[PDB]
Amino acid sequence: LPTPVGMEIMPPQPPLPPDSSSQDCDPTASLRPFATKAEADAAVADIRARGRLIVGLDIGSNLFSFRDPITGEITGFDVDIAGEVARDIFGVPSHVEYRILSAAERVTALQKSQVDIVVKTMSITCERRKLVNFSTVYLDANQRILAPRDSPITKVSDLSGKRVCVARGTTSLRRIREIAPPPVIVSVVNWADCLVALQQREIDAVSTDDTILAGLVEEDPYLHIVGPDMADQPYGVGINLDNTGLVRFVNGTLERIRNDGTWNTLYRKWLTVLGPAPAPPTPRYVD
Ligand SMILES: NC(=O)C[C@H](N)C(=O)O
């Protein structure tokens, strides 16, 4: 039996209070794109000279960034979003190199300038905005619960005292830490590890973005998604705090794909399990 390396039963801790200052900073507002093509091209000249866009992501999130078992290629919604940025830089999307990063390493790789962008289901938060920059929102998810079809778990309070899996370094862990009385919290490196743990009955439920959970359901249709929206998860492209030019550039790409049909095509390609495509998230700008 496969045992995913890195599984930890976390020490019992008192519930954290829900923090109401979380929206103080208006986290989803970002920087307006450049008005001229020449300004935008200048802002990515260093990337262009390096010959490829270096993108941080992983292979642990089915539907978002994973290795296709048939073609062997890294693919998914997040891969395709990153490829549209590369298309804007290079003219075609294929000039991308990946740096494999866990959820807990997304901020550090940006701080250390180890990638140009992170496209890895990265929720935009005020705490993260103290450390990195973000594009406007490219997909809006919400934290829910995944359990086997025969499980009685249907609401948040059912998680108390039960074994709930979360990946380390995620907003999902922070939300589960609010539950009173606490679940038994089992943490792992990536969300695919939570699926293995549930398949082996080493946990009782998984809680994270409904988008990610839908990817797990696609791999294991014995599971289903239950419960209310537990916490908004607005995804942004993560960028080094000081590279404001790249923020504006990526926001230009997002304006393009929201309006030229590409975003709709990518949603239909990857996410129809969640329902018919909504309108793309409306961008918000500070300036
Ligand atoms: N694994 C994830 O990305 C979960 C959540 N979107 C986060 O930003 O932490």
State which of 165, 209, 216, 235 you would mutate to test the pocket of ligand 1, scoring each by most atoms of that ligand within 8 A of its C-beta. 209
Helix (H, G, I), strand (E, B) or coil at 36: coil
State which of 108, 122, 211 you would mutate to test the pocket of ligand 1, scoring each by most atoms of that ligand within 8 A of its C-beta. 122
Query: How many whole angstroms from 199 Cα to the centroid of ligand 1?
Result: 22
How far apart (Å, rounded) are the C-alpha atoms in residues 203 and 184? 9
CA end-to-end span of the chain, whole Å? 54
3-state secondary structure 217-277: HHHCCCEEEECCCCCEEEECCEEECCCHHHHHHHHHHHHHHHHCCHHHHHHHHHCHHHCCC
Query: How many whole angstroms from 235 Cα to the centroid of ligand 1?
Result: 8
How far apart (Å, rounded) are the C-alpha atoms in residues 64 and 60? 9
Atom of ligand 1 nearest to the CA of 190: 1
Query: How many whole angstroms from 268 Cα to the centroid of ligand 1?
Result: 22
Query: How many whole angstroms from 264 Cα to the centroid of ligand 1?
Result: 22
Among candidates 164, 190, 188, 168, which has minimal Cα distance to 176? 164
Annotated binding site for L-glutamate: 106, 121, 123, 128, 171, 191, 209
Annotated binding site: 106, 121, 123, 128, 171, 191, 209
How far apart (Å, rounded) are the C-alpha atoms in residues 207 and 165? 7
Whether 123 contacts 235, CB under 8 Å = yes
Which are the contacts of 245, defined by CB distance < 8 A and separation ≥ 6?
Answer: 42, 43, 44
How far apart (Å, rounded) are the C-alpha atoms in residues 156 and 219? 24
Among candidates 102, 113, 106, 143, which has minimal Cα distance to 47? 113
Q: Both tokens of residue 137?
A: 């929102």
Atom of ligand 1 nearest to the CA of 61: 1
Atom of ligand 1 nearest to the CA of 121: 3
Whether 105 contacts 6, CB under 8 Å = no
Atom of ligand 1 nearest to the CA of 233: 6
How far apart (Å, rounded) are the C-alpha atoms in residues 284 and 129? 15
**Residue tagged 């370094």 (tokens):** 169
Atom of ligand 1 nearest to the CA of 171: 9
Amino acid at 213: L
What is the bridge-based pairing of β-strands 284-285 and 29-30? Answer: parallel
Query: How far is the CA of 239 from the CAs of 53, 88, 119, 286, in angstroms?
Result: 12, 16, 9, 16
Resolution in A: 1.4
Residue nearest to atom 3 of ligand 1 (CA): 121
Whether 203 contacts 165, CB under 8 Å = yes
Query: How many whole angstroms from 263 Cα to the centroid of ligand 1?
Result: 20
Query: How many whole angstroms from 59 Cα to the centroid of ligand 1?
Result: 14
Prior bond to 12 cis, omega within 30?
A: no
How far apart (Å, rounded) are the C-alpha atoms in residues 31 and 148? 42
Amino acid at 6: G
Domain boundaries, the chain: 25-136+237-287, 137-236
The number of CA neighbours under 13 Å toward the Cβ of 284 is 12
Query: How many whole angstroms from 206 Cα to the centroid of ligand 1?
Result: 13
How far apart (Å, rounded) are the C-alpha atoms in residues 144 and 139? 16
Ligand 1 site residues (CB inside 6 A) read 103, 121-123, 167, 170-172, 208-209, 233
The number of CA neighbours under 13 Å toward the Cβ of 67 is 7
Task: Find residue 98's DSSP bridge partners.
Answer: 55
Atom of ligand 1 nearest to the CA of 170: 9
